[PDB]
């Protein structure tokens, strides 16, 4: 068994959290161009036969609530699970519209022992967000 | 016989630990642009880690920041593939 079994009846869920507008009290800019990302991702995974759910401008609390809810579904007939996070971030952190969420809290819901109908199946997290403030100046070559 | 509770995760980060990630105002983020492009072209031909490697090369070679702010101009980006997967992943049959 060198390859994951991907001929279950369903490819799986693809959850897209698209955070564009943040509360001004967080001091955080609007993420122009992210709607293009979210629509691109929806079409891409649609063509791969994933059941896509797009979500926009979720608070800290809505992200955590969405993530536990989804992890409590019956994924038995699903081959895999995909979550895409589109937001501001820091190292280890994704931003809700009103504040930061530890990435470990989101992914812990899907641990092999906490989401048994995904045990043994690939859990993919795609993260478009900053991880700090360092800049890569590149090298000419 | 058990498996680790952290096994079979993949985290496809847009940028390297500690670094900014870049987004074009009009076209979307470099990473998601490239990820969708590579999935469109290679999901029926390549294993997923090799697709993500193509994404790494696209982001690294075809993008460079354009900014009116000199501090933020001409910068580069490398995505960061973090694999705790235990098998190869093919989206095709």
């Amino acid at each position: 068994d060198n390859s994951y079994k991907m001929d279950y009846p369903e490819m799986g869920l693809c959850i897209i959290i698209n955070n564009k507008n943040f509360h001004k009290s967080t001091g955080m800019t609007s993420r122009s161009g992210t709607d293009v990302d979210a629509a691109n991702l929806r079409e891409t995974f649609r063509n791969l036969k994933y059941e896509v759910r797009n979500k926009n401008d979720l608070t800290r609390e809505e992200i955590v609530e969405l993530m536990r809810d989804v992890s409590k579904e019956d994924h038995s007939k699903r081959s895999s699970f995909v979550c895409v996070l589109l937001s501001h971030g820091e190292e280890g952190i994704i931003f809700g519209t009103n504040g930061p969420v530890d990435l470990k809290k989101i992914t812990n819901f899907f641990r092999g022992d906490r989401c048994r109908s995904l045990t043994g199946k690939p859990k993919l997290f795609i993260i478009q967000a900053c991880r700090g403030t360092e800049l890569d100046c590149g090298i000419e070559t | 016989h058990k498996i680790p509770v952290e096994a079979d995760f993949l985290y496809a980060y847009s940028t390297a630990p500690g670094y900014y990630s870049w987004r074009n105002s009009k076209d979307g983020s470099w990473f998601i642009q490239s990820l969708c492009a590579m999935l469109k072209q290679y999901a029926d031909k390549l294993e997923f880690m090799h697709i993500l490697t193509r994404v790494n090369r696209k982001v690294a070679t075809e993008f460079e920041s354009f900014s009116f702010d000199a501090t933020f101009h001409a910068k580069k980006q490398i995505p960061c593939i973090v694999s705790m997967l235990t098998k190869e992943l093919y989206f095709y049959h």
Binding site: T29, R31, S32, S87, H88, G89, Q128, A129, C130 | S14, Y20, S21, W22, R23, N24, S25, S29, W30, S65, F66, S67, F68, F72
Partner: peptide, 5 residues
Amino acid sequence: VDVVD
């Protein structure tokens, strides 16, 4: 222009 996340 490009901007950071």
